[PDB]
Symmetry: C6
Subunit: 90 residues, 6 copies
């Protein structure tokens, strides 16, 4: 029940699924979302302790950058503001 | 406060960074996250005018280096009542 | 009034700025905000012909350097009742 | 009438203008406004053959310079029954 | 008949012309019209192989100069049963 | 089987051709067809690893020259439990 947030955005769903797979395999993080953003952007989101989310996002970024049209963003917010939480499925 | 702050980004990840930075930057409420179509994503905040100013300014600085980056950073100090349904 | 003002933008932030400038410029009611697809957004107002013209001029000026800017500014003074379902 | 007239535009604003000019130029009824994706908008009218011919032409001239403009202007005087679910 | 015919266009208007020519060409049933996203529109038909052959040929010819035109024209004579839910 | 196969295409017609060729080339089941946005279409199959491998290989070859063609062809042999909700 760490509250760190890990995010990877990709071009297309296939690199996003690869990313989430690699993230949840690399460390103890829970997948909490997959968003079809519009325009072809897809974002996957995970939660965990800071160290695990760090390891997960590095792993996801590495795994998906060469899949399909690839990686757009790979970002960690280690302590999201309470206001941000509804955007994360709360 | 009824002042409105808005940041538009390319993709969701810079939008969440913007929202985080905005809400840590000053006393503002995150009231909206919009998938606009075509990859645009907008986040909206409300608060007193001075707070919304600092929030949007921190928001723009934070998300402009994230993902496909920043499109718009804007403030409306006194939004018309007619606009409220769209918020 | 039954006159129609429309502004189309690239992104939601210029649309919201347009809608605010429009409703502040004259006695016009904001009747809608449409996410068109591909990033197009359109805001619609109704009022008397002169009011609507003032409103759209103001909204076109206000939003053209906001975010990815302005696509269309258009006024239909007396819409056909066939079109009203689209409004 | 059962003739079908179609105009496709980039953005919603020229679609509404096309629809308004179409329904003013001849007795035709607006039966549809479709957000197609990517920013395409299609407006659909029905009526007698001559009406629909007059309508589509007028709609094409009117919306041609509005916003990001006109994509398609087309008439099918008697759509096959199998086409109706695709409108 | 289990043969499958498919035409993909840029915009709805060429897709409707494709549909009309396809379904008038031979005895096929229009099982779908999909808004794919980004402006792609796909129309799908079923019938016996000869009918679908004739249909898809007719449709490709008719729509390729209409609007932003034709993307794809394809026939699958005997689709796998696993694909049927997608159909 | 629990291995996952995925082909991503531009448009629905190459996607359906992929799906057909995948399920004909090996014992895999088609679990999904997703309209991703912007015109991306993903088809997803499950099966044993060797089968999913043969399936995606064939699907990639089959759809690459169809319509606007192929974007991605990827296998995940042992998908994490956490990924299952996205499938």
């Amino acid at each position: 029940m760490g509250i760190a947030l890990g995010m990877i955005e990709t071009r297309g769903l296939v690199p996003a699924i690869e990313a989430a797979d690699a993230m949840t395999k690399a460390a103890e993080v829970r997948l909490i979302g997959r968003e079809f953003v519009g325009g072809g952007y897809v974002t996957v989101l995970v939660r965990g302790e800071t160290g695990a989310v760090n390891a997960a996002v590095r792993a996801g970024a590495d795994a998906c950058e060469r899949v399909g049209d690839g990686l757009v963003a790979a970002h960690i917010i280690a302590r999201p503001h309470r206001e941000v939480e509804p955007a994360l499925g709360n």
